[PDB]
Structure formats: structure tokens, C-alpha cells
Design a protein around this ligand. Structure first.
Ligand SMILES: *C(=O)c1cc(NC(=N)N)ccc1[C@H](Cl)C(=O)OCC
Ligand SMILES: [Ca+2]
Length: 240
């Protein structure tokens, strides 16, 4: 997250870190959301490589012991049948991960609330991006969870030539575009938490930013619109 502020410990308990076995260490690669005690929702872009994956819940500092962490293997990976690595503009950037164990819920570990199917936010809706990704374009990862306030930009504006134009689809959400805050590398897969009816729900899965850089004016951060995939999610879980 560029232009973030450090997240309080217990504010975003459905945020996870998706890590891969890097040599003999484990590296943060992505974010995700816990949606079931044994299911994680992240971006399909995060699993394009055939890596050994793990999920960390109750994580606040990647490099220190918080005293709250649960570390769980991934048992199964389900990418969206229409995902294609070479065409991220097409959308379908979503994956579900079945965990090798069910985690224990607590104040640091909760399920992500999903929107109702087909829900679309009003322009300039109040949302937060969270993640441990680059705090600058070509920077380094954050050690602590970061948050940024990132209003939505409706499809009408977002698909205008000045913004993203045709690269964005109605199956996406755009948020931000101020040139100061954004998501950035290592945030994708993660949540966009939007306040609706006085409850935070997860409306986006962080997908991409400009090639030009992370925090680019009139280049919002782009998300998979979760409320487009609700049947899909429920079908996979039912059947796995
Ligand atoms: C985000 O999901 C993502 C994932 C990957 N690959 C893995 N981290 N293993 C590459 C790129 C991205 C996107 Cl494009 C990204 O970083 O978007 C920044 C918001
Ligand atoms: Ca930690």
C-alpha cells in the first residue's frame, strides 16, 4: 500500500498473508481474505506459479512474532475457469484456497463478510485497502499491515478514456486514483473493505495498477468485484 497508515492489530481480522516456500524461508507474495474457517479468497494471479503455498492468519508484522499467528498449509487451489494469466484485463482474477486445517476464530481471526450478489457501490463510496505490499512504486514491502482510504470510482468514470478506458470491465471495481495512495506490488489478492449499512464488507479482490506505477493520478487501483462471483464462490465451496 502506497500512502498507507499502519493498521491497528484487530481492525481487519479477515486479512491473510499468502506466502511461498522460498528456498528454505517463506516469502509474503499476496494478500487474501478468510471467508470460511478452511477457505481463503485471493487473486488467481497469486497462484500462477506452482509453488508451495501457506496462509498466515492473525498476522500483523511479517518479520516479528505477534503472538497471534496461525500458520496453515493450502490443501487445494481453485482458480476461476475463465482466468488467463496473459489477459488480466479480461478479469476473472479470483481464486479460492482450501486450507489443510480449519483455523480458530478470535479477535484477530474472523471471517470476511461478502456482499450480496450484483451489489454495485455508489461513486465515491468509503473503502479501505489493506496489505503488506510495496509502500512506494519500486519500493519494499511493508513490515506491518498497512491501510489506505480509497473511495470508489464508478464504472462510468473508470472506463472513461482519461481513466482506465476499455481495460476495466463491469466485473471490476476501481478505487482511489488520487496519485498519493494505492495498492502496489504484494497487495494483490487482498481485500477492499467497503462500509455499507454500517458494516464493512469485502467488495474487492485487489487485482492491478498502472504499468506506469502504483500511485498514478486517474489510474485507480483495480479490483475484482466480489459481488459478480457470489454464485461461483458458493458453488465451489459446496462442491469441495
Ligand atoms: C496480485 O495478485 C498479483 C500477483 C502476482 N503474482 C504473485 N504475487 N505471485 C503478480 C502481480 C499481481 C498484481 Cl498485477 C499486482 O501486484 O497488483 C498490484 C496492485
Ligand atoms: Ca508476525
Amino acid at each position: 500500500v502506497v500512502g498507507g497508515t499502519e493498521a491497528q492489530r484487530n481492525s481487519w481480522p479477515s486479512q491473510i498473508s499468502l506466502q511461498y516456500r522460498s528456498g528454505s524461508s517463506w516469502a509474503h507474495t499476496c494478500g487474501g481474505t478468510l471467508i470460511r474457517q478452511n477457505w481463503v479468497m485471493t487473486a488467481a494471479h497469486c497462484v500462477d506459479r506452482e509453488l508451495t503455498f501457506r496462509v498466515v492468519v492473525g498476522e500483523h508484522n511479517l518479520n516479528q512474532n505477534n503472538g497471534t499467528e496461525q500458520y496453515v498449509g493450502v490443501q487445494k487451489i481453485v482458480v476461476h475457469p475463465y482466468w488467463n494469466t496473459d489477459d488480466v484485463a479480461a478479469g476473472y482474477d479470483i481464486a479460492l484456497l482450501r486450507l489443510a486445517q480449519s483455523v480458530t476464530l478470535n479477535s484477530y481471526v474472523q471471517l470476511g463478510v461478502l456482499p450480496r450478489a450484483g451489489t454495485i457501490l455508489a461513486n465515491n463510496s468509503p473503502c479501505y485497502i489493506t496489505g503488506w505490499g510495496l509502500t512506494r512504486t519500486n519500493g519494499q514491502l511493508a513490515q506491518t499491515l498497512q491501510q489506505a482510504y480509497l473511495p470508489t470510482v464508478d464504472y462510468a468514470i473508470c472506463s472513461s478514456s482519461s481513466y482506465w478506458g476499455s481495460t476495466v470491465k463491469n466485473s471490476m471495481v476501481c478505487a482511489g486514483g488520487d496519485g498519493v495512495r494505492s495498492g502496489c506490488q504484494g497487495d494483490s489478492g487482498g481485500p477492499l473493505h467497503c462500509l455499507v449499512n454500517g458494516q464493512y464488507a469485502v467488495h474487492g479482490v485487489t487485482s492491478f495498477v498502472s504499468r506506469l506505477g502504483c500511485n498514478v493520478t486517474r489510474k485507480p487501483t483495480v479490483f475484482t468485484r466480489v459481488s459478480a462471483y457470489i454464485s461461483w464462490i458458493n458453488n465451489v465451496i459446496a462442491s469441495n
